[PDB]
Design a protein around this ligand. Structure first.
Ligand SMILES: O=C(O)CCCNC(=O)c1cc[nH]n1
Ligand SMILES: O=C(O)CCCNC(=O)c1cc[nH]n1
Lengths: 412, 412
């Protein structure tokens, strides 16, 4: 936390829109992006719906030749990254290209491509595997391809930490800038896990909601009838920049990234401790890194995935950290609308947290019809809430008990 | 680089041995770990050999019940991690468990498991996918499972940066300690990509040597008859610790981790620039981070994968960075013996770099029969070379043009 880090560009693909403003309009209207899945036939599946990206045209970003070599998760990551870089207005030159890097991650990476190449392998043998199978499927190729396309020669890496991926990606990129390893980073995450292995894998783990009769009502964080998360696809990217660098070029600054915290639960592979102790440690770590007291937090974009154990653990953790102030802040889960974008969740939610600061509005938790026992905070049920927001937190808690929190502030 | 970071424990599985001392004995003897592959039938494949872990017994580390849920790459990562923690002598308690984290990565992750679940899916449908498919296959589950088994509640994450994974994992963990986010980290990487998709995928890219008649001679870095890398499996883990913490508990210190550097080539998805400019930037970054001049480097553990373009680019980069001193240092590729362990390569090579410091010996580049044009440095051809080593560098250059360098020093 030596140099200051601000956000100067954002980009997104989500189930609510093919860019940031379309998605945000959806969020503030309480719109659902969840529908029956169209791109595959799901009769053997217990979950037949999810949050797809609708109408994506990769040829707005890449040639058809380039695009056919890359898994969808890479296409989505590059689309968000290009949007964010364009949004920032930054011009890459010989004088600065060594100072600009990339940290775009994914939870599961190129599962569609792997499954398609596996089909070829099993039907017709190894000679039918694509030559582009490896570089078109490995998780670090969003960072790799972005760097090649834009001539970025700074730190170049990729995280994979399940639902925490996007949060880790952004926080670690911010550390690179704070410590002088880069002046600008493109950071975030992307996911497209809606293939048979993904839907079938999460379904085999009984992780997913099975509310096929009412898909838009399936994702219902903190609601007593919740029954697992909704699988969603897309990407989010931010342009993080050192403050004096941004000021010097006249950049538009959305917000300041002031804190990043991490912890491990060290408890269980998929279930949190019921008191959310690891989440509490993570949020405290983030606030201590920001030099902020818990009483200064106005809004939390929750992890809130619509799981029985997870949702109530996060309430417990918020109550532990914030004490009486827990009833003054607002906390919402935008996964009520978007579903769970896995490795992209923390990226799209960071963008929502920044826009909550820009617009002074807490996005809703839709579908919060009957809050569960102990779920008595301001969860922004049903409808967006205009309010004062100086400090916003975004939480991500992932398989393995891996936790991350980002803290954003209105800039001055 | 605020607090100092030392190495207090190491662990490994490689094609040369099931622990560090066995592997190192192999390295110093110039032994090859490469052989015809036994665990699958490779008649449709143009490459039928590689570096397997021989004789691994997971039940030395895990119950059979636990082990059957985890992909081999996770089993290997946990084995190396447990070895390193035991080697360090550290006792985990309530007073320190929040200060101990994990950063174990992988390049490709659970490809064997994915392929086995894909077979089930295609023959018998999604109901035959394992419930443990997701948590047993995702890359962050080495960090996750290690943390749960040992009660580690510090920073908990995973990198995936192809051949740079292990190098990034260790350097980023060292940053967590240097900046006060942790006092101890277990860091490194693991890989088991020798399934049909892995051998077939790299073969489809024409990335691999096809010297099936002489497998032990296939990996021949800088040799004029090189024809691609040798695919290998295994894991490496280090216990990194803040220096005053190590001293206070009477730890045995192997070496100091003094520098870490990164860059991106921004050139091509799989080929480096012929002058190795990105590698040169990376090494300079690492040395500048260490506060060392190039003339202080005694040994380089090269990336040196046995590829036509890669090997000569790394020579060019070494000549650019080191000038006349390039002819005084020793540089070797231990991949001549081990083959290319992909996401574990940087981890096992960091361990070899540390042991070069401990033992004052440069490991050989075996098979360097006829050095190619311009390959006129001290490449430690054929036989290990006792010599003075105060500073050792380890390089990793990965698909996407992602580069990392670590700098180690004899400690005082
Ligand atoms: O932690 C795990 O192993 C599962 C990932 C999901 N975790 C949670 O929802 C959660 C809520 C509060 N703390 N953690
Ligand atoms: O960089 C790539 O895209 C391929 C990975 C391999 N790169 C190299 O061997 C190399 C040697 C010097 N600089 N880079």
């Amino acid at each position: 936390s030596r140099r200051r880090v601000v956000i100067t560009g954002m980009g997104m693909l989500s189930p609510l829109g093919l860019d940031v403003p379309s998605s945000w309009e959806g969020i503030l209207a309480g719109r659902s992006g969840i529908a029956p899945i169209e791109h595959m036939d799901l009769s053997a599946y217990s979950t037949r719906f999810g949050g797809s990206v609708k109408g994506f045209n990769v040829e707005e970003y890449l040639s058809a030749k380039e695009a056919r070599k890359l898994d969808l998760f890479i296409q989505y990551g590059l689309a968000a990254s290009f949007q964010a870089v364009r949004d920032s207005g930054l011009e890459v030159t010989d004088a600065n290209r060594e100072r600009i890097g990339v940290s775009m991650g994914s939870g599961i990476g190129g599962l569609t491509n792997i499954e398609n190449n596996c089909r070829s392998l099993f039907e017709q043998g190894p000679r039918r595997i694509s030559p582009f199978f490896v570089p078109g499927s490995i998780i670090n190729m969003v960072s790799g391809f972005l760097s090649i396309h834009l001539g970025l020669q700074g730190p170049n890496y990729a995280l994979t930490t399940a639902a925490t991926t996007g949060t880790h990606s952004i926080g670690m990129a911010a550390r690179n800038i704070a410590y002088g390893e880069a002046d600008v980073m493109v950071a975030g995450g992307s996911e497209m896990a809606a293939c048979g292995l993904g839907l079938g894998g999460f379904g085999a783990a009984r992780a997913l909601s099975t509310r096929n009769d009412e898909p838009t009502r399936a994702s219902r964080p903190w609601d007593r009838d919740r029954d697992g998360f909704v699988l969603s696809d897309g990407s989010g990217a931010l342009v993080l920049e050192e403050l004096e660098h941004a000021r010097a070029r006249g950049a538009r600054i959305y917000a300041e990234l002031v804190g990043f915290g991490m912890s491990g639960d060290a408890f269980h592979m998929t279930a949190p401790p019921e008191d959310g102790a690891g989440a509490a440690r993570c949020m405290k770590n983030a606030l201590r890194d920001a030099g902020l007291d818990p009483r200064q937090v106005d809004y939390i974009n929750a992890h809130g995935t619509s799981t029985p154990a997870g949702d109530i653990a996060e309430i417990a953790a918020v109550k532990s950290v914030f004490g009486e102030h827990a009833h003054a802040l607002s906390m919402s889960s935008t996964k009520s609308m978007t579903g769970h974008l896995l490795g992209a969740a923390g990226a799209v939610e960071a963008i929502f947290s920044v826009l909550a600061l820009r617009d002074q509005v807490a996005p809703p938790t839709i579908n919060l019809d009957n809050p569960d026992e102990g779920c008595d905070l301001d969860l922004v049920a049903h409808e967006a809430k205009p309010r004062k927001i100086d400090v916003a937190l975004s939480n991500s808690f992932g398989f393995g008990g891996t936790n991350g929190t980002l803290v954003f502030r209105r800039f001055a």
